[PDB]
Amino acid sequence: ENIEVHMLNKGAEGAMVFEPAYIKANPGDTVTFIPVDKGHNVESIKDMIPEGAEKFKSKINENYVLTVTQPGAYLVKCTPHYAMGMIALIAVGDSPANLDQIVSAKKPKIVQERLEKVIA
Ligand SMILES: [Cu+2]
């Protein structure tokens, strides 16, 4: 199945957001990232994707279709707006083995706050 995500300058959580910022998927699903506002992209965060998953980085302003294979949690960011808290969490399969690790990892305070919220 496909899950559509919008990249926006402003949303329910404030400025520079992914909506939804919490994506539940299963191996084989696709996640479509739509740049509703210009200036955004999607990129996997180093050591914040499952072991065996390939790193990815879309072009600014392009519609990007991500196919998810490996189970686990993935924290993605918008390259330009990471420090402004523009992130999304993709959870593939049940009880992502690396979720606690991602929660604990070093990241910007704004990012951490949004993540905690998304997770809750
Ligand atoms: Cu952005």
Is residue 7 annotated as involved in ligand binding?
no
**Per the annotation, does 40 bind a ligand?**
yes
- Residue 55: name the closest of 44, 41, 66, 69 by CA: 44
- Please give the tally of structural domains in the chain: 1
Is 86 annotated in a binding site? The answer is yes
CA of residue 19 to ligand 1 center, whole Å: 12
**CA atoms of 86 and 18, how far apart (whole Å):** 6
Q: In a 3-state reduction of DSSP, which class is residue 84?
A: helix
* Distance separating alpha carbons of residues 48 and 96, to the nearest angstrom: 12
Task: Determine whether 41 is exposed, middle or buried from the number of CB atoms within 10 Å of its CB (0-12, 13-18, 19+).
Answer: buried
User: What are 50's two structure tokens?
Assistant: 């499952």
CB neighbour list of residue 83: distance below 8 Å, 6 or more residues apart? 108, 110, 111
Contacts of 114 by beta carbon, 8 Å cutoff, 6+ apart: 13, 21, 85, 87
In angstroms, rounded to a whole number, what is the distance separating the alpha carbons of residues 24 and 65?
A: 15
Give the bridge partners for 92, in sequence order: 25, 72
> Both tokens of residue 79?
């390259």
Buried b (16+ CB within 10 A) or exposed e, 81-102: bbebbbbbbbbbbeebebeeeb
Beta strand 43-44 with 72-77 is antiparallel
Residue range of the domain that includes 28:
1-120
DSSP state of 82: G
28, burial (CB in 10 Å: exposed 0-12, middle 13-18, buried 19+): exposed
Q: How many angstroms is it from 81 CA to the middle of ligand 1?
A: 5
H-type alpha helices, 1-120: 99-104, 109-119
For 40, residues 6+ apart whose C-beta sits below 8 A from its C-beta are 7, 8, 16, 60, 61, 78, 80, 81, 86
Which one-letter amino acid corresponds to residue 101? Q
| CATH number, domain with residue 107 | 2.60.40.420
